[PDB]
Amino acid sequence: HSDLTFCEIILMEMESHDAAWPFLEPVNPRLVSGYRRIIKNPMDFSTMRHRLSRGGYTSSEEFAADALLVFDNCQTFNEDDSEVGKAGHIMRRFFESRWEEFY
Numbered sequence: 001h002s003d004l005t006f007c008e009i010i011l012m013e014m015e016s017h018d019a020a021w022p023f024l025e026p027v028n029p030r031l032v033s034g035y036r037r038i039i040k041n042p043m044d045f046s047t048m049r050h051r052l053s054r055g056g057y058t059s060s061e062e063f064a065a066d067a068l069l070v071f072d073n074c075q076t077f078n079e080d081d082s083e084v085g086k087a088g089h090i091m092r093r094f095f096e097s098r099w100e101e102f103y
């Protein structure tokens with residue numbers, strides 16, 4: 001049940017990644033017009049860190065579900081050629097590759 005250890009490794013690496021800047025904190029819907037209306041389930045790296053710190057993950061699969069939610073939301077709201085969108089593609093490819101070179 002120490003897939004949570006690899007969750008720790010991968011989350012540390014995403015948190016320190018250069019392209020992680022759009023995802024370190026929750027999006028503030030007061031500052032982003034339309035975000036609340038379009039994104040039903042917001043997610044971000046600090047929320048995953050908090051959930052992991054309090055033992056809120058029962059398996060690596062739901063951790064991965066939150067991670068993929070970050071980048072699904074990113075691609076849903078932001079254009080692929082937007083700055084946040086580009087960072088999201090870099091981060092998504094990073095997560096998929098790291099997650100697969102363990103499982």
Ligand SMILES: CCc1c(-c2csc(N3CCNC[C@@H]3C(=O)NCCCCO)n2)[nH]c(C)c1C(C)=O
Nearest residue numbers: 021022023026027028029031032035074077078084
């Ligand atoms: C595009 C908003 C965004 C971010 C995000 C996090 S910091 C940031 N920066 C700050 C400095 N340069 C401009 C840009 C910005 O516009 N900051 C105001 C909005 C911050 C509300 O929290 N952008 N991350 C995701 C997943 C986003 C969206 C819309 O999906």
Ligand SMILES: [Mg+2]
Nearest residue numbers: 093096097100
């Ligand atoms: Mg693939």
